[PDB]
Every structure is written in structure tokens, then in C-alpha cells.
Scaffold this active site. Structure first.
Site, PDB file in Angstrom:
ATOM      1  N   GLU A  35       1.210  -0.562   0.461  1.00  0.00           N
ATOM      2  CA  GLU A  35       0.491   0.590   0.155  1.00  0.00           C
ATOM      3  C   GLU A  35       0.907   1.590   0.486  1.00  0.00           C
ATOM      4  OE1 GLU A  35      -3.037   0.249  -0.649  1.00  0.00           O
ATOM      5  OE2 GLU A  35      -4.274  -1.713   0.257  1.00  0.00           O
ATOM      6  N   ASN A  46      -8.082   8.938  -5.834  1.00  0.00           N
ATOM      7  CA  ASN A  46      -8.815   7.857  -6.441  1.00  0.00           C
ATOM      8  C   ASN A  46      -9.340   7.957  -7.658  1.00  0.00           C
ATOM      9  OD1 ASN A  46      -7.710   5.183  -4.477  1.00  0.00           O
ATOM     10  ND2 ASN A  46      -9.145   6.324  -3.061  1.00  0.00           N
ATOM     11  N   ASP A  48     -12.317   7.911  -8.180  1.00  0.00           N
ATOM     12  CA  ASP A  48     -13.674   8.508  -7.907  1.00  0.00           C
ATOM     13  C   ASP A  48     -13.779  10.068  -6.882  1.00  0.00           C
ATOM     14  OD1 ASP A  48     -13.097   7.537  -4.958  1.00  0.00           O
ATOM     15  OD2 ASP A  48     -15.331   7.321  -4.157  1.00  0.00           O
ATOM     16  N   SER A  50     -12.046  10.109  -4.210  1.00  0.00           N
ATOM     17  CA  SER A  50     -11.946   9.832  -2.654  1.00  0.00           C
ATOM     18  C   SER A  50      -9.706   9.922  -2.417  1.00  0.00           C
ATOM     19  CB  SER A  50     -12.382   8.677  -2.156  1.00  0.00           C
ATOM     20  OG  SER A  50     -11.901   7.929  -2.944  1.00  0.00           O
ATOM     21  N   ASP A  52      -7.127   8.519  -1.281  1.00  0.00           N
ATOM     22  CA  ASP A  52      -6.121   6.777   0.629  1.00  0.00           C
ATOM     23  C   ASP A  52      -4.678   7.284   0.791  1.00  0.00           C
ATOM     24  OD1 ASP A  52      -8.617   5.258  -0.750  1.00  0.00           O
ATOM     25  OD2 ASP A  52      -6.691   4.474  -1.928  1.00  0.00           O
ATOM     26  N   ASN A  59      -9.313   4.531   2.773  1.00  0.00           N
ATOM     27  CA  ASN A  59      -9.904   5.871   2.006  1.00  0.00           C
ATOM     28  C   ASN A  59     -10.710   6.343   2.593  1.00  0.00           C
ATOM     29  OD1 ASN A  59     -12.068   6.572   0.194  1.00  0.00           O
ATOM     30  ND2 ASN A  59     -12.047   4.618  -1.273  1.00  0.00           N
TER      31      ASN A  59
END
Ligand SMILES: [Cl-]
Ligand SMILES: [Cl-]
Ligand SMILES: [Cl-]
Ligand SMILES: [Cl-]
Ligand code: NA
Ligand code: NA
Ligand code: NA
Ligand code: NA
Ligand code: NA
Ligand code: NA
Ligand code: NA
Ligand code: NA
Length: 129
Positions: A35, A46, A48, A50, A52, A59
Site C-alpha cells: 500500500e 482515487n 471517484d 476519494s 487514500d 480511504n
């Protein structure tokens, strides 16, 4: 902060992640590796909208507030910035809620694709824990 492998394993253990919800410490280190490469300051946007955050790339769609994710929740009740700290407490506490959410570590797509089913114990091999 960029953790060392064994350094992170030790911190995760101290914060109770080792075998949390049945996931051995190596699972957690492996997930962190893919990650964030062990960097607490890691952020990624992201598609969309959002973002991380942190060692475990938590998220903003569900878990933290960053003020710029429309229609999201903040189920960990923390600012997403808290997830970037050199102190991993907030990331660990939030990850415990995420892993409890029903799909276990599958919540981390990278854990599913790169850690699940592999020899995760290799990630803590040699570490004094
Ligand atoms: Cl490594
Ligand atoms: Cl392990
Ligand atoms: Cl928001
Ligand atoms: Cl599970
Ligand atoms: Na650094
Ligand atoms: Na489990
Ligand atoms: Na990164
Ligand atoms: Na970043
Ligand atoms: Na965002
Ligand atoms: Na994180
Ligand atoms: Na972090
Ligand atoms: Na929010």
C-alpha cells in the site's frame, strides 16, 4: 516517516494488530508494504475523488474526513491527516475497524492481490518481536 520492515512489525504488534481478527502480523506488514512501501506520508487519489492516506492507504470515502470527498463518511472519526503521522496509532485503530467490517483484509485490494495466500510470515522473518 518511512519505517523499516521489522520496525513496523514491532509497532504494529505493540498496537495490537498481531493476529487481530485472525490476521497474523505478516499479513499486516505485507499489506503496508504494497500500500505505502512503509511510508506514513503516502497519499493517492482515487478515480471517484476519494483519497487514500497513510501506511495502510485508508480511504476517505468511508473512514476519515478530508473535506473534499462528497457524500463520504468518517467512520473512524478522525481527520485523514491523522493517518499521515509518524505515530501509527490512528492508522492501526482505524484499520481494526476496517478489518472488522465484514470482508476482513479483502477491504485492502492490494492485500487480496499481493498478500493473500502467500508466505506472509516472510515479512516478519528475522525480526525481534
Ligand atoms: Cl522490505
Ligand atoms: Cl505472519
Ligand atoms: Cl468530505
Ligand atoms: Cl476474516
Ligand atoms: Na521520509
Ligand atoms: Na481471519
Ligand atoms: Na505512495
Ligand atoms: Na503523499
Ligand atoms: Na479526497
Ligand atoms: Na493508513
Ligand atoms: Na500511516
Ligand atoms: Na468525511
Amino acid at each position: 516517516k518511512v519505517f523499516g520492515r521489522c520496525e513496523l512489525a514491532a509497532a504494529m504488534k505493540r498496537h495490537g494488530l498481531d493476529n487481530y481478527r485472525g490476521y497474523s502480523l505478516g499479513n499486516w506488514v505485507c499489506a503496508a508494504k504494497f500500500e505505502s512501501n512503509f511510508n506514513t506520508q503516502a497519499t493517492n487519489r482515487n478515480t471517484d475523488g476519494s483519497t487514500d492516506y497513510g501506511i495502510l492507504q485508508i480511504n476517505s470515502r468511508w473512514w476519515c474526513n478530508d473535506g473534499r470527498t462528497p457524500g463520504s463518511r468518517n467512520l473512524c472519526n478522525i481527520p485523514c491527516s491523522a493517518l499521515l503521522s509518524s505515530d501509527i496509532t490512528a492508522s492501526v485503530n482505524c484499520a481494526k475497524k476496517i478489518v472488522s467490517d465484514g470482508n476482513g483484509m479483502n477491504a485492502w485490494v492490494a492485500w487480496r492481490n499481493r498478500c493473500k495466500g502467500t508466505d506472509v510470515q516472510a515479512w516478519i522473518r528475522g525480526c525481534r518481536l
